[PDB]
Amino acid sequence: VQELGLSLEESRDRLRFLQLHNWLDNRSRAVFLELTRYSPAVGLHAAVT
Amino acid sequence: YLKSVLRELVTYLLFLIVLCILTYGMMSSNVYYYTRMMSQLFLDTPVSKTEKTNFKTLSSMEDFWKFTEGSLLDGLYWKMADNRSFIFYENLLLGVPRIRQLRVRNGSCSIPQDLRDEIKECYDVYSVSSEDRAPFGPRNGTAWIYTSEKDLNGSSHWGIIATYSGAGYYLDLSRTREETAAQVASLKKNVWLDRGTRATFIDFSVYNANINLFCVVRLLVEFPATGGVIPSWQFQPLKLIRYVTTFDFFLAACEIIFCFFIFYYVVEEILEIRIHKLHYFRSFWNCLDVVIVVLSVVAIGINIYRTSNVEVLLQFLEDQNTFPNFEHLAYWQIQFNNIAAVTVFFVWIKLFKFINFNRTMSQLSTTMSRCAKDLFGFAIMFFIIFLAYAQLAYLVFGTQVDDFSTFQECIFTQFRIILGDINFAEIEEANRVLGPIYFTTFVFFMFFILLNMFLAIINDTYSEVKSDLAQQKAEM
Amino acid sequence: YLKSVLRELVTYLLFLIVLCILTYGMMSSNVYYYTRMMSQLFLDTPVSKTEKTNFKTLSSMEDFWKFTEGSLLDGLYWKMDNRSFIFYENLLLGVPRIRQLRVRNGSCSIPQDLRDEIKECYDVYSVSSEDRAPFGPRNGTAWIYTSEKDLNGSSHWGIIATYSGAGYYLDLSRTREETAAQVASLKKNVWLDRGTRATFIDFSVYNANINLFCVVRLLVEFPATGGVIPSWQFQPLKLIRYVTTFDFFLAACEIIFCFFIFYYVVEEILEIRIHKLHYFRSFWNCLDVVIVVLSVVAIGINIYRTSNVEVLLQFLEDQNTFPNFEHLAYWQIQFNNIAAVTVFFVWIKLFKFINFNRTMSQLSTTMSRCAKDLFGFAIMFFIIFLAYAQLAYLVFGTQVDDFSTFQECIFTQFRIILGDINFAEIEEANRVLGPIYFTTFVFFMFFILLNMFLAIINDTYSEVKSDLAQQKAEM
Amino acid sequence: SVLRELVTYLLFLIVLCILTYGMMSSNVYYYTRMMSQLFLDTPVSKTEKTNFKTLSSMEDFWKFTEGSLLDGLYWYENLLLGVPRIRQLRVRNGSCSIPQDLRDEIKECYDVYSVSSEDRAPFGPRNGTAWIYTSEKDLNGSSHWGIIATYSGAGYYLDLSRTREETAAQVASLKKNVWLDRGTRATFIDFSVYNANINLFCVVRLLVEFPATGGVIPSWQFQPLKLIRYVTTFDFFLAACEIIFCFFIFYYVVEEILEIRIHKLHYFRSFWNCLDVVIVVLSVVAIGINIYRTSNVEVLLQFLEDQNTFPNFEHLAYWQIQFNNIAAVTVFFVWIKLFKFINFNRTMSQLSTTMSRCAKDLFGFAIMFFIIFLAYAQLAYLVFGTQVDDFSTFQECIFTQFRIILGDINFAEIEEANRVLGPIYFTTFVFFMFFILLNMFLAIINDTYSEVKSDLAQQKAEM
Amino acid sequence: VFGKTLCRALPELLGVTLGLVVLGVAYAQLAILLVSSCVDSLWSVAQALLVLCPGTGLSTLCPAESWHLSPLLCVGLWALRLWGALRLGAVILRWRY
Amino acid sequence: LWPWMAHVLLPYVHGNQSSPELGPPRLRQVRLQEALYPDPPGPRVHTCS
Numbered sequence A: 001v002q003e004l005g006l007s008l009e010e011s012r013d014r015l016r017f018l019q020l021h022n023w024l025d026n027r028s029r030a031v032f033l034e035l036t037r038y039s040p041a042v043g044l045h046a047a048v049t
Numbered sequence B: 001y002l003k004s005v006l007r008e009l010v011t012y013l014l015f016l017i018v019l020c021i022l023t024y025g026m027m028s029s030n031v032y033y034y035t036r037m038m039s040q041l042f043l044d045t046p047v048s049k050t051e052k053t054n055f056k057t058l059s060s061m062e063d064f065w066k067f068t069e070g071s072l073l074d075g076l077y078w079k080m081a082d083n084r085s086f087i088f089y090e091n092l093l094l095g096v097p098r099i100r101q102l103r104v105r106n107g108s109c110s111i112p113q114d115l116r117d118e119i120k121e122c123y124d125v126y127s128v129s130s131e132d133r134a135p136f137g138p139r140n141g142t143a144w145i146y147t148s149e150k151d152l153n154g155s156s157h158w159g160i161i162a163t164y165s166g167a168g169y170y171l172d173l174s175r176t177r178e179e180t181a182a183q184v185a186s187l188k189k190n191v192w193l194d195r196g197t198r199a200t201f202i203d204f205s206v207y208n209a210n211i212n213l214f215c216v217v218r219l220l221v222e223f224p225a226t227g228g229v230i231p232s233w234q235f236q237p238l239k240l241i242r243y244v245t246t247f248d249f250f251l252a253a254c255e256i257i258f259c260f261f262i263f264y265y266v267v268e269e270i271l272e273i274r275i276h277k278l279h280y281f282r283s284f285w286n287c288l289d290v291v292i293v294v295l296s297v298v299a300i301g302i303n304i305y306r307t308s309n310v311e312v313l314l315q316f317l318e319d320q321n322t323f324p325n326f327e328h329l330a331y332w333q334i335q336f337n338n339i340a341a342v343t344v345f346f347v348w349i350k351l352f353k354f355i356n357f358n359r360t361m362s363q364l365s366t367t368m369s370r371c372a373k374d375l376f377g378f379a380i381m382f383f384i385i386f387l388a389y390a391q392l393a394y395l396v397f398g399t400q401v402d403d404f405s406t407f408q409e410c411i412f413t414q415f416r417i418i419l420g421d422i423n424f425a426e427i428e429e430a431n432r433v434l435g436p437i438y439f440t441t442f443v444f445f446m447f448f449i450l451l452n453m454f455l456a457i458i459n460d461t462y463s464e465v466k467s468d469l470a471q472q473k474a475e476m
Numbered sequence C: 001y002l003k004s005v006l007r008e009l010v011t012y013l014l015f016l017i018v019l020c021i022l023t024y025g026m027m028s029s030n031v032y033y034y035t036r037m038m039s040q041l042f043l044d045t046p047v048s049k050t051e052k053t054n055f056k057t058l059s060s061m062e063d064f065w066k067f068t069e070g071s072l073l074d075g076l077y078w079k080m081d082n083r084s085f086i087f088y089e090n091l092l093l094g095v096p097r098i099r100q101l102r103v104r105n106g107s108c109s110i111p112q113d114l115r116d117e118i119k120e121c122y123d124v125y126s127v128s129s130e131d132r133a134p135f136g137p138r139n140g141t142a143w144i145y146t147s148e149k150d151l152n153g154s155s156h157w158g159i160i161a162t163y164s165g166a167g168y169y170l171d172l173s174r175t176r177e178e179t180a181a182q183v184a185s186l187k188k189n190v191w192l193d194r195g196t197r198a199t200f201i202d203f204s205v206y207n208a209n210i211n212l213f214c215v216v217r218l219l220v221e222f223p224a225t226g227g228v229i230p231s232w233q234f235q236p237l238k239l240i241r242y243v244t245t246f247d248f249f250l251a252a253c254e255i256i257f258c259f260f261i262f263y264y265v266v267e268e269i270l271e272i273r274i275h276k277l278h279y280f281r282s283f284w285n286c287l288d289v290v291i292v293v294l295s296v297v298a299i300g301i302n303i304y305r306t307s308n309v310e311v312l313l314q315f316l317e318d319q320n321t322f323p324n325f326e327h328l329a330y331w332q333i334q335f336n337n338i339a340a341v342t343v344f345f346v347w348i349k350l351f352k353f354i355n356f357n358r359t360m361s362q363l364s365t366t367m368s369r370c371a372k373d374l375f376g377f378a379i380m381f382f383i384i385f386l387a388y389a390q391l392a393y394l395v396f397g398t399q400v401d402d403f404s405t406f407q408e409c410i411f412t413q414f415r416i417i418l419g420d421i422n423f424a425e426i427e428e429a430n431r432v433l434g435p436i437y438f439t440t441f442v443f444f445m446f447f448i449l450l451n452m453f454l455a456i457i458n459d460t461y462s463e464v465k466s467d468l469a470q471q472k473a474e475m
Numbered sequence D: 001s002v003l004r005e006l007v008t009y010l011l012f013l014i015v016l017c018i019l020t021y022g023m024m025s026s027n028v029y030y031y032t033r034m035m036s037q038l039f040l041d042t043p044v045s046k047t048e049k050t051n052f053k054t055l056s057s058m059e060d061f062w063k064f065t066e067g068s069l070l071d072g073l074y075w076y077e078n079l080l081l082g083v084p085r086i087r088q089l090r091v092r093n094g095s096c097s098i099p100q101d102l103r104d105e106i107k108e109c110y111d112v113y114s115v116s117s118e119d120r121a122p123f124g125p126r127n128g129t130a131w132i133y134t135s136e137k138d139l140n141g142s143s144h145w146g147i148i149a150t151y152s153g154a155g156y157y158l159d160l161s162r163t164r165e166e167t168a169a170q171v172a173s174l175k176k177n178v179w180l181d182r183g184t185r186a187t188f189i190d191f192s193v194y195n196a197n198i199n200l201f202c203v204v205r206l207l208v209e210f211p212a213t214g215g216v217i218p219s220w221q222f223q224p225l226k227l228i229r230y231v232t233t234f235d236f237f238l239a240a241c242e243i244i245f246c247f248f249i250f251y252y253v254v255e256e257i258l259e260i261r262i263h264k265l266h267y268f269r270s271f272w273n274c275l276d277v278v279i280v281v282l283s284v285v286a287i288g289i290n291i292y293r294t295s296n297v298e299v300l301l302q303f304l305e306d307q308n309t310f311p312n313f314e315h316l317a318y319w320q321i322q323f324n325n326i327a328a329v330t331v332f333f334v335w336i337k338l339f340k341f342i343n344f345n346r347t348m349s350q351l352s353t354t355m356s357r358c359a360k361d362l363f364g365f366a367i368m369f370f371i372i373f374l375a376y377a378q379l380a381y382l383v384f385g386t387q388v389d390d391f392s393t394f395q396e397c398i399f400t401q402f403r404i405i406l407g408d409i410n411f412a413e414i415e416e417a418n419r420v421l422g423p424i425y426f427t428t429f430v431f432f433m434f435f436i437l438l439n440m441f442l443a444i445i446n447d448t449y450s451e452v453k454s455d456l457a458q459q460k461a462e463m
Numbered sequence E: 001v002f003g004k005t006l007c008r009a010l011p012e013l014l015g016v017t018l019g020l021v022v023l024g025v026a027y028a029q030l031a032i033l034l035v036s037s038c039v040d041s042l043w044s045v046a047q048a049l050l051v052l053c054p055g056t057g058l059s060t061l062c063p064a065e066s067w068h069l070s071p072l073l074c075v076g077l078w079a080l081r082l083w084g085a086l087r088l089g090a091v092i093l094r095w096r097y
Numbered sequence F: 001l002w003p004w005m006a007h008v009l010l011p012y013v014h015g016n017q018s019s020p021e022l023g024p025p026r027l028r029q030v031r032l033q034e035a036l037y038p039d040p041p042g043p044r045v046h047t048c049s
């Protein structure tokens, strides 16, 4: 797992660190990015995968 | 017997030809091209040279801002002391267009207590209870001040997501392009469409003096609380200066003749229902009469209430530098058109009462009237099964397919599936299982079972009717 | 079985063979590719390099001026005075002609209320309200009205209205430079005002390899509401028939067909004089009368057409004028329609002779006895169909362009049965009473009216079989 | 004895199914599609947006010859089988009778292509075989049946070379001198490839037709040929399946001979025995052509080493496609005999009896229906046959009507071509087929079913 | 009556369905063997195969990538396209009614 | 994948707008320990077995 960071600025640094440190090229069975959203106007959650 | 039937048929034929003349007059020669050119000028033009998006395919709020100061201004003002504008060198732009905004207030939505640290603003969905009524931004003019519905001479609209009020924050644009561009730029700079906005309206009208036909244009953009943009449009041709040519007088004469015919039918109906046959409803040829009379009376009342309320035209004609209010007339014209179409359809259906002049036509009518009961009895079960499938599809596929999003849309999708007008990709990718099962079982049980049982019933009824008439006639 | 029916069969087969040869000899291949290449050259070519607009998608008057000075002059004039070969095979005959029809200012009655703001009104096109006065630099024939009789013209029946054969015309040149200069001077002095209602461009080519003239006519209509409506017509004709032996063979076949028609006419006339007077109570006699009258009409059209070749001789006398071949193309289209109808009827006349055994006889009797009930129910079916078509016309007749005309409403209703209608436009045209019409129409067509036809056919077939079996088994 | 004769039929069917699986999963379709995209859809040059499928002029053909053709021809990777050949067929000036009215305006006209009007004279620089007419027998050619005519196959021909530079120089020389005059009527390009890293052969023929009016018409033909090589147990398994199929065919033929030895004429009155002989003859023809076409492997592999001559692998393609459309018919017929074996219960029994009783009336009404269908097709051909592209040819009219029955109408072109009598044809055809003609087969079937049920019910009552 | 008939005429519908399935299997085998021959040549093979799948072959009206995904859906689609065969069921039902 | 995330997803997570986040995203990878080999073009339609 990789948490991608919290702030926008550090997130780019984490992304490029994963780019240039031999992370996804070789083995990489899957990537599995996932997100969640909240809509309080209608009170609905959303699972994004 | 038949002697009075001849008189009844003659009167019905005169009524039918009068109605046909009236409908041909109301639906005149090709005004389709008028609305065609207007729509293609405003709906199909890309918002800019680089972008390929238009009004019909709006995606975000920035696209709306690009369209407003963009394709709209290009299609509104045409060059040819502050001269008017002719859109196609034929259509005159009446007065000025108007833009309007409907928005909600911040705090009409209670977020959970344990989450009140990362988020602090929630905007509810649109409702008259939660509508904003306070000034905002640089509060200078009518664009940053709430104006009531009765002060705007407005009314409801019944858009797609909800029904929108006639109030909001409005702004009247100008007659020249530079002034309107400056106004729209000033609106965009001092941010006018924030997260609280819920609907935007643009209204204007044109004349096209060559033919005598006004056109009212209304464009609506809805911003749902869940995000996105939903565009819609409404172009309506009207006629408010009717009495110009001879054909107009001919149509007026046909109108008063139609009124006299309706009065005659009402008098006949009352006279016959009063004296005898106080039950009067076991015929199905008398319910049609009352339905036709009611529809025609409603149409006459709507026409009377609509043609006499042309005061807005008089107010506009004494000051042509103001926005003309023509939405009510368009709404009532649409209602009148719907009622007239239904009435003429039923008048045409009424012709079945008189097509009986030989043994071939009598037996077909007898067969239809005899099998109507059995057809209704089986259609109850057919519709129960149809609605079961519709509700299952609505509950399962309703949130992913764009074609099962509403119950009526599910019904229409099923009716299209009957015609073979379905695409299997979306229904399958929405659900790997229970997707193919639904489609296959529906098609099989609808074409192999339900469609053939109707034929069985109809054929049995027709066979027994024909056989019993043949036996009675051959043995008398 | 006996000699009379055998003679009738032999005569009918000979007549059918003659018609088959005659129709095959006029609808060969290489005629489709001719018009196809011509259409691709003139219609699909963009008006200019920087624009993707072509003739089929014209939208304004400036687009028309771009097309006239653009793809038209590229597709008409090809470099090897000199003559022009379109595809190095097609020879451009004479010069093309351009002609406009316009109405006069003041052909309206502007309402008194708005009389102070709008001063100009031009009515929709009509013969009674069309301009007949000079305008602009009134020196040439492009600024002077020329009557229909002086232009040898005729009506056209365009998309919006039926246009007259008169108007303001101009004859172009044989070389690209002169035509370009002429069109440039015609555009500089504004020739297409707000009163312009229609524009026509006409020319022709020969293609001497095969023997087939081609006549090209392009029409652009300007409605009173603003816009442009383009239409086209490419038509091949043969006017120099007797060039090869096959043409003489076709002429001999035509003479044989004329003799056959005369024989049938004299037979039919000889029948109804006293013998079976009012014999119109049979289908095979009304069919014969229809075939005879259609063939007589076709023969008369052909005689009146082929004897009118004075235009070709006049053009051949002086090859620097405009060839007028529109009437020949119109009459050729009419003759083709009549020939197709009569060949269809003579083909379906074959059912008079297929009764060689009991199966064919039973099927023929069943079809014969189904006619009355099927017609009686078709009356009701078409009553309901017309009611639905009128409702759809009154509801969607201004937004959906499948219901924009009553006959278009009928065709759209017929296409709905096949299920090739979007339903997306009629959903947004009217959210209520739009879907109601669609669902109710589908339910009443698929569930109540198809099964009734099937039931009638089933019952009639069963009754016919029972009656025939009783008749045959009780000898 | 039915059960014994059931297991043999199921074994025959499963063997045929294994053979069908071997045939369909040969993965030859992918190679043809890939190389078709390589040669056809590739643009001539990136400066021009055009390809072979959308050729429009003679100069476009010249660009294609020295261009995408030379690029794809000399590069997943394919190996050339010698030298490609390019030939043309042309007519002669003077095969054409100008009417005397305008004989002074036009001097040259060339007729349409025909054997009688063909040209057999030298032209241009009479150097080699590209400027000399060589008869059909000297090129081992045959007819073609192209789009608009049937082409003899003699022409003026030229064989290219092995390297790209030599062929480019030859094409440049052929374009410098005007090889494609106004009299040219057809052009053929033929070659064959191997695709070294796969066990396949392919034959490519590209045709360009120049009509007497103008423009060009392109057409293409790619035919794959597979030679049998044993690399795994799958190959041996399929060889065993083929030999078992041959043995089963022998069993059926000997059984049929034994049965017919005492049924001189009491054999053809049935239906399930008349189908057996058809199956047998189709299978033995397929076996014969398969064992014939397989005796050319040494010829196929004799050209890939160093040969610099044109290989004529065309009759191989003809026999291969004959085998391809024989196998489908034979498997269809065995799957039909599967109906013959399904008569186990009274339900299927009465269904089969109904069909067998109503077949004759079905045939008669099919005759009437096809008469009416052909009348409508002829009317459509005569009315829309020149401007619609869906009625250009009679077979195209028939197929368009069949697609109309299955709901595939266009109706824009139909109504545009003829505003009156165009919609009339469509409306009348739809009304008379959808509502009347197609509802008459069901009447016959329903009546036969009722008669069969009544007969069975009345027979069962006293038994 | 209605439901009763639907219960009394069930084996006939099963037999009709089985026959139609076998016939469809035979026709599908014929079509698959015919189509996978070569590229366009305008021959009689495509003439016989053009009686289905819109335009002398459209991968059995459901694309091959979608063909190896729930073939039951493709079966339903092909039943919808050739819905005139299902009218044979009426032949049974009427008699029972 | 990396340009798509750096251009689309990152301006959507920290890009304050409607539908709040409710928890940071995550990227989880599967190694498979059995580094795969490239295959010839072929008909593809691989089941990745």
Ligand SMILES: CCCCCCCC(=O)OC[C@H](COP(=O)([O-])O)OC(=O)CCCCCCC
Binding pocket: D405, D406, D433, D434, D435, D438, D439, D441, D442, E081, E082, E083, E084, E085, E087
């Ligand atoms: C085997 C080919 C089946 C394809 C039928 C064509 C599809 C079709 O739509 O025809 C169904 C037809 C009813 O008319 P319609 O559905 O065409 O409007 O109903 C019929 O006419 C049924 C006739 C077929 C019965 C013959 C089966 C041996």
Ligand SMILES: *[C@@H]1O[C@H](CO)[C@@H](O)[C@H](O)[C@H]1NC(C)=O
Binding pocket: B106, B107, B120, B121, B122
């Ligand atoms: C919305 O209201 C909340 C209080 O509920 C406040 O904290 C927040 O700043 C407001 N947002 C605005 C005015 O944009």
Ligand SMILES: *[C@@H]1O[C@H](CO)[C@@H](O)[C@H](O)[C@H]1NC(C)=O
Binding pocket: B151, B152, B153
């Ligand atoms: C509403 O109508 C009145 C006249 O009845 C007019 O004076 C007023 O200006 C209208 N409202 C607006 C916002 O123009």
Ligand SMILES: *[C@@H]1O[C@H](CO)[C@@H](O)[C@H](O)[C@H]1NC(C)=O
Binding pocket: C105, C106, C119, C120, C121
């Ligand atoms: C057009 O007709 C009007 C009607 O009075 C007239 O005033 C005007 O001068 C005419 N010409 C033009 C160019 O408007």
Ligand SMILES: *[C@@H]1O[C@H](CO)[C@@H](O)[C@H](O)[C@H]1NC(C)=O
Binding pocket: C150, C151, C152, C314
């Ligand atoms: C119309 O036909 C006559 C007949 O000779 C001819 O003289 C005249 O020139 C034609 N009209 C035009 C405009 O050429």
Ligand SMILES: *[C@@H]1O[C@H](CO)[C@@H](O)[C@H](O)[C@H]1NC(C)=O
Binding pocket: D093, D094, D107, D108, D109
């Ligand atoms: C074609 O033949 C005609 C007939 O003699 C002749 O006049 C003409 O010069 C020839 N043209 C060529 C290019 O050979």
Ligand SMILES: *[C@@H]1O[C@H](CO)[C@@H](O)[C@H](O)[C@H]1NC(C)=O
Binding pocket: D138, D139, D140, D310, D311, D312
């Ligand atoms: C047949 O062989 C080649 C092509 O197969 C051809 O060029 C040659 O002229 C023909 N004759 C002989 C004897 O090779």
